[PDB]
Design a protein around this ligand. Structure first.
Ligand SMILES: [Ag+]
Ligand SMILES: [Ag+]
Ligand SMILES: [Ag+]
Ligand SMILES: [Ag+]
Ligand SMILES: [Zn+2]
Length: 415
């Protein structure tokens, strides 16, 4: 349903949902084959050597939790598997009510059209589009919200990447920007069942495997914060004082990560700072409402001013008065803000998937495993690794790398 058609890496390009594309702001690059799996969402089965200029080399840089393999995702078979793996994960996520809500929010989360220097003109920002090569060879500029792409040099460094603006802080000013998620459905992390063990850097080999659907959901949640322009400034961190090994090393974790995980982790952000951020972003939305009201012109005859004004009215859940003037209703703002920051959390997704998972973001990496979720015999949209009939359905046996040994190959231990 979420991905209505089957995609094969070798399917011929049609210039519509299967095409060679170029990422603007990415400098000079060769067109790469991409697949549009859903409205506003694309997948590029390639290692990411375009978003960051100084990150085009896949070989292990000079001399930590990291894993390198310059050959991963270099063959057509691997790219086909990557595409099928990612599509499958989106479907697993969409199969839950929470995931359906999240993906709906992501599609509705179009980056704001605030690219004009004139306050009466509404214009798209080039950081939020890709250039799509058409059958006739010409290019077609297309707006999009999300792009799933292969990892860069460090295979296990999953993260959101987005292009910046000269002056605008798009991921924190309420505007939002297109997010490129480096991710792989072909590897997963190992964790320990015991809290005392999982949060200790010297113990555990990583007996249980993280369900990659949770990992992708985690990145999607993080991406949606950036899409709605309410990501917490990275300089806002928590000087961990709840873990003796974190304090010992003076390690710090950004509020953004704690918020994304949810559960008890989010409670580390004290009430004052919580209100501070909410007030801040409430004001940013008011700014978007004013800009819309001040808009009398629009660029790009792909839609009318009335249409786009309404698109953002929906995205930001703004209120329109009798005169057709937009404003931000505190109740509505608080509702949307809470949905994006408290309802969509890693902890809540675990409850929906019914999988075993780390209990806190404040733990220690144990290991990385190679996996293959494409075959139904190994992983299904409905149960992940814990197959219904199989003897893998209970006690999370499917995620148990010792019992379900054939589905996991430990590549590196971090403990
Ligand atoms: Ag553009
Ligand atoms: Ag565009
Ligand atoms: Ag992110
Ligand atoms: Ag991300
Ligand atoms: Zn994160």
């Amino acid at each position: 349903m979420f991905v209505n058609k089957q995609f094969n890496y070798k399917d011929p390009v049609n210039g519509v949902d299967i095409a060679y594309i170029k990422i603007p702001n990415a400098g000079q690059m060769q067109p790469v084959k991409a697949f549009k799996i859903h409205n506003k969402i694309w997948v590029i089965p390639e290692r990411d050597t375009f978003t960051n200029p100084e990150e085009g080399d896949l070989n292990p840089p000079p001399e930590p939790v990291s894993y390198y393999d310059s050959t991963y995702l270099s063959t057509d078979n691997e790219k086909d598997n990557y595409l099928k793996g990612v599509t499958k994960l989106f479907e697993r996520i969409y199969s839950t009510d929470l995931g359906r809500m999240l993906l709906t929010s992501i599609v509705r989360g179009i980056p704001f059209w605030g690219g004009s220097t004139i306050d009466t003109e509404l214009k798209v920002i080039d950081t939020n589009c890709i250039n799509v090569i058409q059958p006739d060879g010409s290019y077609r500029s297309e707006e999009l919200n999300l792009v799933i792409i292969g990892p860069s040099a460090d295979i296990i460094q999953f993260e959101c990447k987005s292009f910046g603006h000269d002056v605008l802080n798009l991921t924190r000013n309420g505007y939002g920007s297109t997010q490129y998620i480096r991710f792989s459905p072909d590897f997963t992390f190992g964790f320990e069942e015991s809290l005392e063990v999982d949060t200790n850097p010297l113990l555990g080999a990583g007996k249980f495997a993280t369900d990659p659907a949770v990992t992708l959901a985690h990145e999607l949640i993080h991406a949606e914060h950036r899409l709605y322009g309410i990501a917490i400034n990275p300089n806002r961190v928590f000087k961990v004082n709840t873990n003796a090994y974190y304090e010992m090393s003076g390690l710090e974790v950004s509020f953004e990560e704690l918020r994304t995980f949810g559960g008890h982790d989010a409670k580390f952000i004290d009430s004052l700072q919580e209100n501070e951020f909410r007030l801040y972003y409430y004001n940013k939305f008011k700014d978007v409402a004013s800009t819309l009201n001040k808009a009398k012109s629009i660029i790009g005859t792909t839609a009318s001013l009335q249409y786009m004004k309404n698109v953002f009215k929906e995205k930001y859940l703004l209120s329109e008065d009798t005169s057709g003037k937009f404003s931000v209703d505190k109740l509505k703002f608080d509702k949307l803000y809470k949905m994006l920051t408290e309802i969509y959390t890693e902890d809540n997704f675990v409850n929906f998937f019914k999988v075993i998972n780390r209990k806190t973001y404040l733990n220690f990496d144990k290991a990385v495993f190679r996996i293959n979720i494409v075959p139904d015999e190994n992983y299904t949209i409905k149960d992940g690794f814990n197959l219904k009939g199989a003897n893998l359905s209970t006690n999370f046996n499917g995620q148990n790398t010792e019992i379900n040994s054939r589905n996991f190959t430990r590549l590196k231990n971090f403990t």
